[PDB]
Amino acid sequence: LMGPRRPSVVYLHNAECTGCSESVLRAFEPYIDTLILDTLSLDYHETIMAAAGDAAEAALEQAVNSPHGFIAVVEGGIPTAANGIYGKVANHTMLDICSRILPKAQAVIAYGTCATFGGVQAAKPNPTGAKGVNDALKHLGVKAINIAGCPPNPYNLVGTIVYYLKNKAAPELDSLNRPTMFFGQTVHEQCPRLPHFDAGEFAPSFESEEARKGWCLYELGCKGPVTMNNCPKIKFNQTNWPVDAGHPCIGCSEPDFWDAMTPFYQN
Amino acid sequence: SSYSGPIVVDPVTRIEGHLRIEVEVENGKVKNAYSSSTLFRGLEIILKGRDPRDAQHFTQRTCGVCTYTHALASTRCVDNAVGVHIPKNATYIRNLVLGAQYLHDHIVHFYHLHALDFVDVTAALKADPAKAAKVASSISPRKTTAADLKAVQDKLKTFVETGQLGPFTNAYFLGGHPAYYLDPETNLIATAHYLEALRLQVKAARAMAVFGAKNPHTQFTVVGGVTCYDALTPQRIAEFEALWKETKAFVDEVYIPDLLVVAAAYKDWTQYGGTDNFITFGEFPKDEYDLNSRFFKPGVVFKRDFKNIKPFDKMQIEEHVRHSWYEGAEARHPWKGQTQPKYTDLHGDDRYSWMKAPRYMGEPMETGPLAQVLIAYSQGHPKVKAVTDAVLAKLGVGPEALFSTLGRTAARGIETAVIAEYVGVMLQEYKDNIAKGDNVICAPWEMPKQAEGVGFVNAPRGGLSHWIRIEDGKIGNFQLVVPSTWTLGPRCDKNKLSPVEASLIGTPVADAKRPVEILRTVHSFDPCIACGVH
Ligand code: SF4
Ligand code: SF4
Ligand code: F3S
Numbered sequence A: 001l002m003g004p005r006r007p008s009v010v011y012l013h014n015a016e017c018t019g020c021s022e023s024v025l026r027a028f029e030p031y032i033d034t035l036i037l038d039t040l041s042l043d044y045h046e047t048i049m050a051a052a053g054d055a056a057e058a059a060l061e062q063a064v065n066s067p068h069g070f071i072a073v074v075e076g077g078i079p080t081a082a083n084g085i086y087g088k089v090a091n092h093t094m095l096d097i098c099s100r101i102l103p104k105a106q107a108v109i110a111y112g113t114c115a116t117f118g119g120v121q122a123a124k125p126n127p128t129g130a131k132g133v134n135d136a137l138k139h140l141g142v143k144a145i146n147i148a149g150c151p152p153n154p155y156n157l158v159g160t161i162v163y164y165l166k167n168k169a170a171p172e173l174d175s176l177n178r179p180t181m182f183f184g185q186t187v188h189e190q191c192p193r194l195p196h197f198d199a200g201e202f203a204p205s206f207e208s209e210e211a212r213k214g215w216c217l218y219e220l221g222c223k224g225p226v227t228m229n230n231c232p233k234i235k236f237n238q239t240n241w242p243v244d245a246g247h248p249c250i251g252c253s254e255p256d257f258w259d260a261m262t263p264f265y266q267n
Numbered sequence B: 001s002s003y004s005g006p007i008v009v010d011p012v013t014r015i016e017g018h019l020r021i022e023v024e025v026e027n028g029k030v031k032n033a034y035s036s037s038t039l040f041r042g043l044e045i046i047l048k049g050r051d052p053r054d055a056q057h058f059t060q061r062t063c064g065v066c067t068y069t070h071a072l073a074s075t076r077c078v079d080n081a082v083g084v085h086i087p088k089n090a091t092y093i094r095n096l097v098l099g100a101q102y103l104h105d106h107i108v109h110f111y112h113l114h115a116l117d118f119v120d121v122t123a124a125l126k127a128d129p130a131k132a133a134k135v136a137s138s139i140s141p142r143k144t145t146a147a148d149l150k151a152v153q154d155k156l157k158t159f160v161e162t163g164q165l166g167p168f169t170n171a172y173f174l175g176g177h178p179a180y181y182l183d184p185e186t187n188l189i190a191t192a193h194y195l196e197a198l199r200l201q202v203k204a205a206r207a208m209a210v211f212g213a214k215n216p217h218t219q220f221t222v223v224g225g226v227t228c229y230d231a232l233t234p235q236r237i238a239e240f241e242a243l244w245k246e247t248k249a250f251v252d253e254v255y256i257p258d259l260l261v262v263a264a265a266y267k268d269w270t271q272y273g274g275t276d277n278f279i280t281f282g283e284f285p286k287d288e289y290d291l292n293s294r295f296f297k298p299g300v301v302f303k304r305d306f307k308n309i310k311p312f313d314k315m316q317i318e319e320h321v322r323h324s325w326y327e328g329a330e331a332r333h334p335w336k337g338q339t340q341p342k343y344t345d346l347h348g349d350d351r352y353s354w355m356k357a358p359r360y361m362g363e364p365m366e367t368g369p370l371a372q373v374l375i376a377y378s379q380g381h382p383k384v385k386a387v388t389d390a391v392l393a394k395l396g397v398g399p400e401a402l403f404s405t406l407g408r409t410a411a412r413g414i415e416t417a418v419i420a421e422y423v424g425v426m427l428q429e430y431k432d433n434i435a436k437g438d439n440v441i442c443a444p445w446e447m448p449k450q451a452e453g454v455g456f457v458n459a460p461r462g463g464l465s466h467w468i469r470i471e472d473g474k475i476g477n478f479q480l481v482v483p484s485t486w487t488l489g490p491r492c493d494k495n496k497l498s499p500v501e502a503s504l505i506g507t508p509v510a511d512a513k514r515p516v517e518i519l520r521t522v523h524s525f526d527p528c529i530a531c532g533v534h
């Protein structure tokens, strides 16, 4: 699947919605075909790989055991309740799969808030005991680079990989293990509506003339002031982001945001 | 002779989510099948007690392949519970983002999820690119030259000679496979278009973010309408229109001609993967409270009796748990739904999946593009009739060919083509409405302390419904009944095989170690297990 010249990537899916995988398909300059043909060797990925079943299991084993080394990219939280039973692939628990594979990686990237912090299935009452990768695997010494968001900006994944391949090391990380080059500012300090915030000019409702005029969404719940991400800077799909579409930030790059940021329409 | 014994496919790749397929084969043909979904998250449990306005943000994370669809279903559900009638422009904008979702979704499904079951990418290296160019130019008004295709071949050659096959590692076609039929040139055309589609889908997805903030996981819907005042501007509408036009050209000039050339080469696949019963909810409403106002209308068909389409009665849905990993055996209407996980391992107490088993009047129902297309055809839908007849004639087959894996795959293309044209109609109506001076996009509403609501979406995989019971102004019960639940859930307490299980009976398997025929039928339903289980 690999050996030679392109660095091997093993992409794992735990308890996930596949939105983070889809976000990588939106990669722009470079696009995903350049990424898979030129930059990297994508050696396991359940969403797009040709092999299935035993043949897919064999592909995974051959990539993880490569003397060339591999990078792991992990999407989704790890369900840990009831000995990991709520999530299995090839009749192995996701907890067991990740416990066996991730300590062998040269580097691990947790991609998306579910893999970084536990995410939507970890919201109260967390029936499956879902955990982020570093929480789940602390005891095995796994320290994944956390690229948060639901899903993250794919600019942030490619930027981190490229950095890693160049410098043979992680970039500067914050106290949530997220790269400071992408997560060092609040989305609020970057927001075009900040002058309205400063002036106390808040939309009181989505149907209001103030909302039509682009006033600040804080009274309608915006979590921009407590959320670290580069959304207003990079935007999504080269064209938009939530508050330019008129909707508050829901805090989706922050740990436990499903419980910390709710109700989404209150501050 | 032929293989007798079990085959297990776990993981089923090139789907969303975690699926285990088990079959029994006798003399080289499948005799029995089980659809086992092997991840549970429990979003219905997590929603209990929360603010109904928050539901769409959680339920959108049911699935990022069919992104937006669950936000739309939850917002329709809470809209309905609160009794708000959203403004005309919110209906248009919501409908336009949903049409863009179907084009993105079905294009990615055919190329990036389904086509590796039918395309031998490595054989493309042996093709004659001048011969392939002639073929490509004969099936599409788009002209393709020998140099165009050689560029792809040169790129693939460099990739393969590195020994790092990446996503093609251990492909079922490597080495050759008796169930792979295409000639080298057709493999090269499909492979070129697979690669082209990787970039085209970026534009198809961008179309959703023009109005919808971002893809994946849009952020422009609210109870009462939408938030995106910028979507009224000529600049955003023009940006959307240009991405739609380019996406529609790809559908018309690349995807459908490829679909037809592959279906022609695999015409034996009209003989496998049929199903009996069909359900569809309709989509693209003029009136949020009348399903019959939708461009595609709802309907129910039993035993392929399309001369007797039955109305859809939302009270005749029940979700079974007898063969699922939930407590007990009692089926429930989703306004009385229960989500009480209880794992027994594979076939423990005859249970083998985290999906519930929805039944309509006790019957297992296929939903998705084949249900939408066949039911609309049988309702006299003129656009659906015009392009399904053109497809049938090109392929030289009768309408019975539609009741199959090949027919289902073709129906996915037919609805893509029909929706791609209808998006232009919706777009014009939206423009016209703005021009009359209607600039309203959100309506005011009030939260009742007690209410029931339901929202219906016909998503790219079929009939989606979200069901809420509001108690003390909070979520008392929230139940998702999702298209893949219908299609790929397990048996019910009457032991009826689900559509995917039943469709697998009779599948030939040339090589049990590389059971591509099972993948062809399973992938034809476009499974989404995060959707089906939530
Ligand atoms: S982080 Fe969000 S988008 Fe990514 S897998 Fe989790 S729920 Fe899906
Ligand atoms: S809309 Fe949100 S991110 Fe922007 S200024 Fe207001 S609170 Fe800050
Ligand atoms: S909801 Fe998420 S995508 Fe950005 S604007 Fe807020 S961090």
Ligand SMILES: [Mg+2]
Pocket: B044, B356, B479, B480, B481, B482, B533, B534
């Ligand atoms: Mg459900």
